């Protein structure tokens, strides 16, 4: 569950980029087919995305690094 997001506002520069990176993570988790790095409690993708953002291991920089890693893995598998 999730009630307040002020702790997320603390770790991110503002709320707009926060919800943007959260939506990107939610797209990666729901239709992207990626596993959640935090054990869920029968919550939706938005709640677990916000929780993983609050834990500090996921943000815009981490997400673009992961995207670059996935792209280079894909182009190495294709060859």
């Amino acid at each position: 569950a999730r009630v307040t997001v002020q702790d997320a506002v603390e770790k991110i520069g503002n709320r707009f980029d926060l919800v943007l990176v959260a939506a990107r993570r939610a797209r990666q988790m729901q239709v992207g087919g990626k596993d959640p790095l935090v054990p869920e409690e029968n919550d939706k993708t938005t709640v677990i995305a916000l929780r993983e953002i609050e834990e500090g291991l996921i943000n815009n920089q981490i997400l673009d690094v992961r995207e670059r890693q996935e792209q280079q893995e894909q182009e190495a598998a294709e060859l």
């Binding site: 569950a1 997001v5 709320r15 926060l18 029968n42 916000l50």
Partner: protein
């Protein structure tokens, strides 16, 4: 399997669809909206809980911001329907994220008449009541003595409080001291956080 079977089951409203409805509204917020919208608080986000009835149960502390009395006011509900949408409603339009009005720094979550009357009666001390002059260890014992009926609600009593003060850093120093306050304030002390 198909959409027709699900539609027929929803129309029939079997016992196997209610749990699905509870699961889809586990963390899917909705948007409450008043008919005349003045400021940002005219539309808010809330997590819905299912209730058997035909009316929308509303929190008493938020309708003051809505300027919505319960004399027959009808309000509307909307669904975000998108991941970006649900995350935005949970992040920005949520009621918790809007505690101060955008006009003035004063909080918009100010309590209403019922709760403030209850607390005033709880703390308005008299001169003589059941248990005037006794001593209580903690607020839990005060609540026990009150609910037991052996004492009144408002009476000057010497109790012991254990308060916490925030130091320069993120430290919560603890100090236990004997105060002379009414039983109502001592009982209410179990609610306020330590800071």
């Amino acid at each position: 399997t198909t959409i027709k079977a699900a539609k027929k089951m929803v129309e029939r409203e079997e016992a196997v669809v209610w749990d699905i409805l509870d699961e889809v509204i586990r963390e899917h917020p909705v948007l409450l909206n008043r008919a005349p919208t003045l400021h940002r608080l005219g539309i808010q986000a809330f997590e819905p809980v299912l209730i058997e009835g035909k009316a929308i149960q509303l929190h008493p502390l938020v309708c003051a911001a809505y300027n919505a009395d319960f004399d027959g006011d009808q309000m509307a509900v909307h669904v975000p329907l998108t991941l970006e949408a649900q995350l935005e409603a949970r992040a920005l339009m949520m009621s918790t994220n809007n505690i101060l009005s955008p006009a003035n720094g004063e909080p918009i979550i100010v309590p209403s008449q019922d709760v403030v009357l209850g607390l005033y009666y709880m703390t308005r001390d008299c001169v003589n009541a059941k248990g005037e002059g006794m001593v209580l260890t903690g607020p839990k014992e005060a609540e026990r003595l009150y609910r037991s009926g052996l004492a009144s609600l408002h009476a000057r009593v010497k109790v012991r409080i254990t308060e916490y003060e925030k130091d320069a850093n993120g430290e919560l120093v603890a100090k236990t001291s004997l105060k002379d306050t009414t039983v109502g304030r001592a009982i209410l002390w179990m609610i306020v956080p330590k800071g």
